[PDB]
Amino acid sequence: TQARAADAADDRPHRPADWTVHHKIYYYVLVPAFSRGRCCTAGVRFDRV
Amino acid sequence: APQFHRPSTITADNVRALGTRGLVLATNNAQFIMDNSYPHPHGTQGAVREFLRGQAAALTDLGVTHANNTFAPQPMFAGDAAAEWLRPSFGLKRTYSPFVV
Amino acid sequence: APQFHRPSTITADNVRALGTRGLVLATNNAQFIMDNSYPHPHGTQGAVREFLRGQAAALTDLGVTHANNTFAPQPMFAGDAAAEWLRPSFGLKRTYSPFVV
């Protein structure tokens, strides 16, 4: 996911500590504030994609 | 040529062989008097069934005269694909402009 | 030419030599009848895998035909530059128009 695929990463990340917290803000809260029940996930056939 | 004041005259070949431009002025220049001593064999309602078999085969002849204007229409709805195992079938929401300069 | 109605024909050399302009038409114009008398050695899931390295490595081919078109790939991010001891490594947001007349 990071900008530097040359300076790759398996153990040491690139993101701040609030980065996933920001996603936990954006996914768990804001999308239900626009959902009113109407949204759902998807599992991806990346071979088809 | 078909006569549109007689019930037992209108066939499928009389409408298809006549052009779509020629179908306009032929029907507009008929006679107001309807004749009733020799009728159409399938009745008065059956002659209207036979008249509509020529106009449906006339746009297919009109599509040939405009085949050098539009393209080949790719499918509109999914479920129609040869390869359904590595990709989906798309479906054209046909918002395009079929036109060949 | 790889036959798209038998999965025992798709290799990476046969698809990369094919352009992506022509792979649009070859998928929709095939035979709908899937055949099952010659299976695939990597499995039928491995035949989809062998198809997509054939498409991905062909993306260099569709790009090299457009090599007189776009610009040099600017370093998008920091850390990609040689001399670091007095000036930094820039990262160029590639929001421009890659086009050379």
From Swiss-Prot, chain A:
Subcellular location: Virion; Host nucleus
Domain of life: Viruses
Function: Self-assembles to form an icosahedral capsid with a T=16 symmetry, about 200 nm in diameter, and consisting of 150 hexons and 12 pentons (total of 162 capsomers). Hexons form the edges and faces of the capsid and are each composed of six MCP molecules. In contrast, one penton is found at each of the 12 vertices. Eleven of the pentons are MCP pentamers, while the last vertex is occupied by the portal complex.
Family in the record: Belongs to the herpesviridae major capsid protein family.
Subunit structure: Homomultimer. Makes the hexons and eleven out of twelve pentons. Interacts with triplex proteins 1/TRX1 and 2/TRX2; adjacent capsomers are linked together in groups of three by triplexes, heterotrimeric complexes composed of one molecule of TRX1 and two molecules of TRX2. Interacts with scaffold protein; this interaction allows efficient MCP transport to the host nucleus. Interacts with capsid vertex component 2/CVC2. Interacts with the small capsomere-interacting protein/SCP.
Record's protein name: Major capsid protein
Organism: Human herpesvirus 2 (strain HG52) (HHV-2)
Lineage, broadest ranks: Viruses, Duplodnaviria, Heunggongvirae, Peploviricota, Herviviricetes
